[PDB]
Amino acid sequence: ALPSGSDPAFSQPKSVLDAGLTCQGASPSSVSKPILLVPGTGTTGPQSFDSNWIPLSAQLGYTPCWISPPPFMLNDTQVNTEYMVNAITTLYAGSGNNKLPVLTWSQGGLVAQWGLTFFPSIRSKVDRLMAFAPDYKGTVLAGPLDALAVSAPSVWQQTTGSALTTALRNAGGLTQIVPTTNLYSATDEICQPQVSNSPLDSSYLFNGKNVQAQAVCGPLFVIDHAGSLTSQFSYVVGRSALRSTTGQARSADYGITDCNPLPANDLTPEQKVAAAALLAPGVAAIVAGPKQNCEPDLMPYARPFAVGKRTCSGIVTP
């Protein structure tokens, strides 16, 4: 069974969580058909989505909303999740007490599933999850000890084997909690392993709609970590998932003819250029951000699920 009962307390003051939430042309507290966008590591909401799902979700009839947890999604993934939980509580009420879809890139999907696993109050407020290149198992390519003995807190947590990914898995988080679509690529240069088209893949959730692009488009089809978010193929799958009556993308809605790895057709020329350039801010932000030589401690609500792991303060104990 999943964690149940009360939501964990926020470590951040709520006013700080509110400051990280924005909607385009609307207040989060009075918004029609919001979609909550959760960005990837090293980026803000606008940096992740200005070139793709902010305009694309608008043209599908949603009000694009996003969180930008400081600094650039580099802090503790457990803190980034508080931004999302507060945003769901706010947007649910602000939209007339209606469930809303959540759309994510990279760590944003890990954040979404962490929130669903450990904050039971939001399960009934999230309609569906559309995750592009989510690293629910982390990645073996993270290299928190690569080129420098200190790395951002969330880089430690997204390393395969981390206490965080261990606790997510042991608490039941690798099975979908709301209707979920995961779109990912075997050629992802940031998140691996993704090659098996099976539960071994970091983006795979049991009972989710798990769409490895090469399983539809062929073994030699190439989209990278950013293209998993921005490509025309990704748009067709994401549009399917958002419109589906089941809450998940439908195999009937996309096919080999949608296997275009370039930025979504409906983007402006300036958006397509920006979409192709995606990753660079969120490679550089690392440089100027918080860095440490250990994985952040697990919050008490998650510690029983990673017994035997090791974090900054010592051995994980319940």
- The dihedral formed by the CA atoms of 21, 23, 29 and 35, expressed in degrees to the nearest 10: -100
Q: Does 13 help bind Cl ion (rule: CB under 5 A)?
A: yes
Give rounded-to-5 percent helix, strand, coil for the chain.
Answer: 35, 15, 50
Site for Cl ion in 156-185 (CB under 5 A): 158
Q: Minimum Å distance from CB 201 to Cl ion?
A: 16
Q: Does 314 help bind Cl ion (rule: CB under 5 A)?
A: no
Task: Convert residues 131-160 into a mask of x (bound to Cl ion by CB under 5 A) and - (unbound).
Answer: ---------------------------x--
Q: Does 231 help bind Cl ion (rule: CB under 5 A)?
A: no
Look up residue 245 and give its two tokens: 């009556």
The answer to whether 66 and 31 have CB atoms below 8 angstroms apart is no
Candidates 37-45, 72-80, 171-179, 300-308; binding stretch for Cl ion (CB under 5 A): 37-45
**Measuring CA to CA, which residue among 165, 78, 180 is closest to residue 123?**
180
The answer to whether 154 and 75 have CB atoms below 8 angstroms apart is yes
Candidates 12-20, 124-132, 200-208, 219-227; binding stretch for Cl ion (CB under 5 A): 12-20
Residues 6+ apart with CB under 8 A from 234: 132, 183, 223, 227, 228, 264
Q: Minimum Å distance from CB 127 to Cl ion?
A: 23
Task: Convert residues 41-60 into a mask of x (bound to Cl ion by CB under 5 A) and - (unbound).
Answer: x--x----------------
Q: Minimum Å distance from CB 263 to Cl ion?
A: 14
Q: Closer CB to Cl ion, residue 44 or residue 203?
A: 44
Candidates 22-30, 57-65, 97-105, 213-221; binding stretch for Cl ion (CB under 5 A): 22-30
Q: Is 97 left (phi over 0), alpha (psi -120 to 50) or beta?
A: left
**Measuring CA to CA, which residue among 199, 189, 214, 82 is closest to residue 136?**
199
3-state secondary structure of 20: coil
Q: Does 14 help bind Cl ion (rule: CB under 5 A)?
A: yes
Based on the residue annotation, tell me whether 202 is a catalytic residue of this protein.
Answer: no
Long-range contacts of 194-202 (CB under 8 A, 24+ apart): 199/174, 201/137, 202/134, 202/135, 202/136, 202/137, 202/138, 202/139, 202/160
- Find the catalytic residue in 225, 228, 234, 240: 225
Q: Minimum Å distance from CB 191 to Cl ion?
A: 8
Among positions 286, 295, 298, 299, the unique one binding Cl ion when judged by CB under 5 A: 295
- For the annotated catalytic residues, the residue numbers are 106, 188, 225
Q: Which residues bind Cl ion (CB under 5 A)?
A: 13-14, 25, 41, 44, 68, 158, 294-295, 310
